[PDB]
Amino acid sequence: GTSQWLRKTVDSAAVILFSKTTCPYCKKVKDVLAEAKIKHATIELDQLSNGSAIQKCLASFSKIETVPQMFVRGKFIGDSQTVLKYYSNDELAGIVNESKYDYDLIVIGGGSGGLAAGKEAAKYGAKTAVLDYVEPTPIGTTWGLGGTCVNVGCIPKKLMHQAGLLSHALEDAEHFGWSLDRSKISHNWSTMVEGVQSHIGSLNWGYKVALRDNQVTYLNAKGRLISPHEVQITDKNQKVSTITGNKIILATGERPKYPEIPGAVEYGITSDDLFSLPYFPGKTLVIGASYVALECAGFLASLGGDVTVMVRSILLRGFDQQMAEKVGDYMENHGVKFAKLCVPDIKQLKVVDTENNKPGLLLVKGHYTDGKKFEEEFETVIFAVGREPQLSKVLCETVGVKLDKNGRVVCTDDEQTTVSNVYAIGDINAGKPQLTPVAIQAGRYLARRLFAGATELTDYSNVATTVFTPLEYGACGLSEEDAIEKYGDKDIEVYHSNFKPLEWTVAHEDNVCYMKLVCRKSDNMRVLGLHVLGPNAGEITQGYAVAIKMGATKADFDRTIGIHPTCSETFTTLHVTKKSGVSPIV
Amino acid sequence: GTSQWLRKTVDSAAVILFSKTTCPYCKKVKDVLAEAKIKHATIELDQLSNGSAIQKCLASFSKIETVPQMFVRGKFIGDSQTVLKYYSNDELAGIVNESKYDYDLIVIGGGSGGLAAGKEAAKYGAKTAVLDYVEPTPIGTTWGLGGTCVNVGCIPKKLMHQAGLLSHALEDAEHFGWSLDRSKISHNWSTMVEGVQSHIGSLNWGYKVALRDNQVTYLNAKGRLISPHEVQITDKNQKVSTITGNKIILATGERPKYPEIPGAVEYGITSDDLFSLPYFPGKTLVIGASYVALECAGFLASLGGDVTVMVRSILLRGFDQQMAEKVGDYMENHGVKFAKLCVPDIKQLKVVDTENNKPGLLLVKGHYTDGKKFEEEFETVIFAVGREPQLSKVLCETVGVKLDKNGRVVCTDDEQTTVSNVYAIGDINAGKPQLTPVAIQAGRYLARRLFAGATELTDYSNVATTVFTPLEYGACGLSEEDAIEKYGDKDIEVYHSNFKPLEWTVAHEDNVCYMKLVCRKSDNMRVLGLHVLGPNAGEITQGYAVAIKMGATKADFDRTIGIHPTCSETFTTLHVTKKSGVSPIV
Numbered sequence A, B: 001g002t003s004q005w006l007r008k009t010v011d012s013a014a015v016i017l018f019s020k021t022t023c024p025y026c027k028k029v030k031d032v033l034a035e036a037k038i039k040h041a042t043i044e045l046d047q048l049s050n051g052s053a054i055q056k057c058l059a060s061f062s063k064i065e066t067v068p069q070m071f072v073r074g075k076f077i078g079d080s081q082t083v084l085k086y087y088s089n090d091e092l093a094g095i096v097n098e099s100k101y102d103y104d105l106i107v108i109g110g111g112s113g114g115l116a117a118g119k120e121a122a123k124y125g126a127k128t129a130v131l132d133y134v135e136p137t138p139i140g141t142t143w144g145l146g147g148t149c150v151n152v153g154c155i156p157k158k159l160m161h162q163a164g165l166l167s168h169a170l171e172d173a174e175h176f177g178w179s180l181d182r183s184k185i186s187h188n189w190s191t192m193v194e195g196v197q198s199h200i201g202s203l204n205w206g207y208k209v210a211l212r213d214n215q216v217t218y219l220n221a222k223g224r225l226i227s228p229h230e231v232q233i234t235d236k237n238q239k240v241s242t243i244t245g246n247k248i249i250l251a252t253g254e255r256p257k258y259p260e261i262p263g264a265v266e267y268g269i270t271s272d273d274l275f276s277l278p279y280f281p282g283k284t285l286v287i288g289a290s291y292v293a294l295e296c297a298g299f300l301a302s303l304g305g306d307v308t309v310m311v312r313s314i315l316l317r318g319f320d321q322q323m324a325e326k327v328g329d330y331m332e333n334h335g336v337k338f339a340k341l342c343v344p345d346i347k348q349l350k351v352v353d354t355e356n357n358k359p360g361l362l363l364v365k366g367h368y369t370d371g372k373k374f375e376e377e378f379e380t381v382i383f384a385v386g387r388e389p390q391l392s393k394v395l396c397e398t399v400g401v402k403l404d405k406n407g408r409v410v411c412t413d414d415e416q417t418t419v420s421n422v423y424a425i426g427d428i429n430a431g432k433p434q435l436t437p438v439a440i441q442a443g444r445y446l447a448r449r450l451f452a453g454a455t456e457l458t459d460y461s462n463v464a465t466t467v468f469t470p471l472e473y474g475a476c477g478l479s480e481e482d483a484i485e486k487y488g489d490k491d492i493e494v495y496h497s498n499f500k501p502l503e504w505t506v507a508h509e510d511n512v513c514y515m516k517l518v519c520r521k522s523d524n525m526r527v528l529g530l531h532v533l534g535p536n537a538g539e540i541t542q543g544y545a546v547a548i549k550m551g552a553t554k555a556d557f558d559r560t561i562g563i564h565p566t567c568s569e570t571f572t573t574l575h576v577t578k579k580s581g582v583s584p585i586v
């Protein structure tokens, strides 16, 4: 147990010092390593309840039982006297840079997970390379370092959501006494895009600075794993070469899908293109009903667009469907049109005018599930019909990395693949929630297990979410229907209430915001799931995710006192049950 | 234990039925009570693990051991056959209305706590009266039913805070692409006040409707307790009479203090007058440094006012002083002036012009702690120098209710005074946090213990707060300095970080928002206190208060995953300690 941990830690750490906080000989080795600019992990044995056993087991590797003990890539280097000997003879730099491989770690993919893992590994002296390449979209769109969230995801989508929210802030301002006239104010798409892209550019640059300052090698090149320790890279001049690494992290993410219909790739766009589009989309059709589809349709309408969403079956498949219907009803009452139970079968009427900065014009044909026809003209058609990896481009099938039937990597609970030195994190890890903070935690925690002797695993359960539709939807845990399927309706109690933000009173709806707690009767009214539709829903939801992680019950919500006046305090006084039939209105 | 609970429950309930969910004889008594419109508490013995013992102990009162058993004001009324006998003979209405007193409950004070207690007691058949009277301010201001929060506190102050926030929403809108020009927009105070007061008026009316629909008697009269069961009332015609009640709840709240200096009462105002003021205050001095003082100065400045705050010693005494200084620094950088270490020694230069709706003009003289002089002219002077009860007006000292040296009521942990039938809730309960949700929980929980056999007490520990200054400050638990005083600096670890809202990037400060967790090393890094300065701080803080109630540790925050992009997620990845000396900047 202790011995098995120590073997794994010694074998995979790049540079590690076993030490105690009270030893001046350990302090004297630290100071020499710092002055030589030698980064390393350190384990302070006097701070571990198991340290006496670890100190005994170290002798299996070094034939000594004292501290300090310095290891480099699985090899005992020496005690105090020996390390200073190498230092005085200027032999130390060559000893700690000695490796069978070019890098201790090669990360394939420079996005949320991969950048987090690479920076964290370099902290402990792992010689690290991060590879990133952005294959252009069909119309040619490309972007800089940072991945999907930074460039074409969470960051620009929430900034355009805020632009949409400010439309209603402007309307509200009149009722609170300000002299503006909202009906005479308009929005300039190109001005907003320039500001969004200026922020994204500061993030691209920030990541490059961060890697340089952590001594991480950044290669803007496409990587391919051709054997367990060999990565073939192709650069911007099509030069092809091979680099080797001890540990490999796959972190290449996904890209948008297109439907297999005529004209889709030629004349439509995806979210990859939307966030840098030089012209306002105009009259827009969004095909799909995921959170990407609804978030984009929502802010486009708030910015003055004529928007339609084509829904094949249901909204927000996989989310609580009572909540999904309330989200969509709010959008439909506030300027979004819906074509329900409908799919597309795209013809070009006008080519995009790039010189005068105008969209083209398209004719869309489709059909409803009963057979009736759809036919209408749009200036822009956005596909939001799912995302997928293309690991055949990343991974030679002779390496032996197992994939599932959706093409994602099958991993153990420590992110290890079926090849012992190769790991996968982020969206390509089969079965895991596909979110940026999950990818960051996985990569950071993994780097610490590989190179600093850590043991902590990432916990993927009850991860909270927020959908940034015009009225936001936050959730943590099970949907009501999933809880009833798992435990049975007789064991499920649901407490719920409508509410009205105080900010909405002077601004003139009473009963559109809504919240509920889904609870298990036979486990002390355990909170299985929390759901809220209203302003600032992500700020509301986040703190409750800690309580749910700790096993909160309805009694825990009851005994906690509210903060007044807030939206969130309504969770502290819920009392109306669905079984009672009593109305939830205010 | 069981027998002592049952004696207290029988003695004080107004109308209570002991029953089981499976008994058709109990269902048959319920249906008769409902049809006669007889409200009552019910205790279902088959749902209590102690019910077998309760059923045995009932025989001590009734000489029978079966269900149903109906009691009225401590007296056994009968089993099934007997109750239907009274019903058939039309004797039942007179039996259940029989009382030695006019009311089962008299509530003195119709504010946050008193309205909550009165409505809840009426649910269980307690015949209830609520008394409310609003003594006018020195200049004559008065208002309707609902108490301090509704009329001259949390509700209007947060609505004017929102009006202030919308000033910065208007500036931000230009950067996000909207065509407005903020420098050409102004604010109309009287328009905002009319809208705020229209909402307050809907709340006044709503409370009157609610009491009428719960069969609560509302008397707009001043109440005085002259003996344990006798309340003398004085109405709007100076008619004086006496009503009697079994249980009494004191819930009369506090009013603003004035400094003992010439001209203060004659020429200054307080928060009681501010929220319905017919004219804009103009150039304003706020004397004091409480959360009331800073909240009011903050929104007045955001609405275009020239504002100064006179601070005797420190800001936000009793709150974390690192956080208090950051709150004040933000205000000073954003248009509020501060006169530090200064107190006033007020002369009238112009009388208020009520016909043309203009303030007067005043000369304020004061001095700094070193002896230097203060002298400046203002249009309005607002005093925010504390609040106090005046229980000598409410409570004859011969009744025997014990008060502390600040004039607040000394209560047991179930809100009982030194007179056994008299209770106190809300701001006048000595030692308790003076907040609206605390008053509401105390009153609701108390009504259930008196009239429904409940046992649950109000928990007054770790109650979260938010100060609605221009940049908001939320907190839950100990300040850093209180934790260090209690446990010693060697046992305290503090994790902290600056942060920048994503909404602030395109809008153009980097390092003003701030958060920290104050933790106890020797108790598994228990979170003793949480603190955040930033937008939407009350929404951020609320959910964490449940986790802190449950004993959250730093490890609980670490294992929980963030929601991206939010401000609140920064709590899930804190790592920089104050002891390390590493910078907290972004």
Ligand SMILES: Cc1cc2nc3c(=O)[nH]c(=O)nc-3n(C[C@H](O)[C@H](O)[C@H](O)COP(=O)(O)OP(=O)(O)OC[C@H]3O[C@@H](n4cnc5c(N)ncnc54)[C@H](O)[C@@H]3O)c2cc1C
Pocket: A108, A109, A110, A111, A112, A113, A114, A131, A132, A133, A134, A135, A146, A147, A148, A149, A150, A152, A153, A154, A155, A157, A221, A222, A223, A224, A251, A252, A253, A254, A271, A292, A393, A394, A425, A426, A427, A428, A434, A435, A436, A437, A439, B563, B564, B565
């Ligand atoms: C529109 C949209 C909105 C979203 N909004 C949110 C949100 O609000 N909150 C949230 O938590 N999540 C959100 N997400 C999800 C989030 O973007 C992803 O979960 C996250 O980016 C996944 O991180 P990753 O490291 O797995 O991959 P990525 O961030 O996709 O990074 C992979 C990188 O590797 C590169 N790469 C691929 N193949 C190779 C190769 N062979 N060689 C070298 N480099 C290669 C890719 O081009 C890319 O730069 C959103 C996603 C989208 C599409």
Ligand SMILES: Cc1cc2nc3c(=O)[nH]c(=O)nc-3n(C[C@H](O)[C@H](O)[C@H](O)COP(=O)(O)OP(=O)(O)OC[C@H]3O[C@@H](n4cnc5c(N)ncnc54)[C@H](O)[C@@H]3O)c2cc1C
Pocket: A563, A564, A565, B108, B109, B110, B111, B112, B113, B114, B131, B132, B133, B134, B135, B146, B147, B148, B149, B150, B152, B153, B154, B155, B157, B221, B222, B223, B224, B251, B252, B253, B254, B271, B292, B393, B394, B425, B426, B427, B428, B434, B435, B436, B437, B439
């Ligand atoms: C400016 C300001 C802002 C505040 N903001 C907040 C905030 O954001 N959040 C928060 O949680 N708290 C806030 N508070 C505190 C909150 O208002 C109080 O904690 C709460 O109102 C106390 O409730 P209560 O029932 O104890 O008394 P009150 O609400 O004061 O009700 C007492 C009532 O009894 C009446 N009364 C008095 N004497 C008699 C008598 N003899 N006979 C009959 N009736 C009588 C009074 O006139 C009054 O109507 C604020 C307070 C102020 C002053």
Ligand SMILES: Nc1nnc(-c2ccc(O)cc2)s1
Pocket: A162, A165, A166, A168, A169, A170, A172, B169, B503, B535
């Ligand atoms: N952080 C923020 N996100 N949205 C804001 C907003 C939205 C709608 C409004 O009516 C007013 C303000 S502020």
Ligand SMILES: Nc1nnc(-c2ccc(O)cc2)s1
Pocket: A133, A220, A221, A222, A234, A235, A236, A237
């Ligand atoms: N900057 C760049 N890095 N790699 C590039 C690349 C790689 C493989 C290809 O097939 C085509 C282009 S371009």
Ligand SMILES: Nc1nnc(-c2ccc(O)cc2)s1
Pocket: A287, A288, A289, A311, A312, A342, A343, A344, A384, A385, A386, A387
């Ligand atoms: N018309 C359509 N709307 N959604 C579609 C979809 C969504 C996710 C997927 O992974 C695959 C397809 S097709």
Ligand SMILES: Nc1nnc(-c2ccc(O)cc2)s1
Pocket: A169, A503, A535, B162, B165, B166, B168, B169, B170, B172
């Ligand atoms: N609920 C809300 N409270 N404030 C809001 C706001 C404030 C400042 C801004 O810049 C934009 C919006 S929305």
Ligand SMILES: Nc1nnc(-c2ccc(O)cc2)s1
Pocket: B133, B220, B221, B222, B234, B235, B236, B237
């Ligand atoms: N509407 C009102 N109810 N009571 C009033 C009152 C009571 C005592 C006084 O001393 C003066 C006025 S006015």
Ligand SMILES: Nc1nnc(-c2ccc(O)cc2)s1
Pocket: B287, B288, B289, B311, B312, B342, B343, B344, B384, B385, B386, B387
């Ligand atoms: N000049 C002053 N600023 N604050 C004061 C104060 C505050 C609370 C109190 O309870 C009493 C006095 S006096």
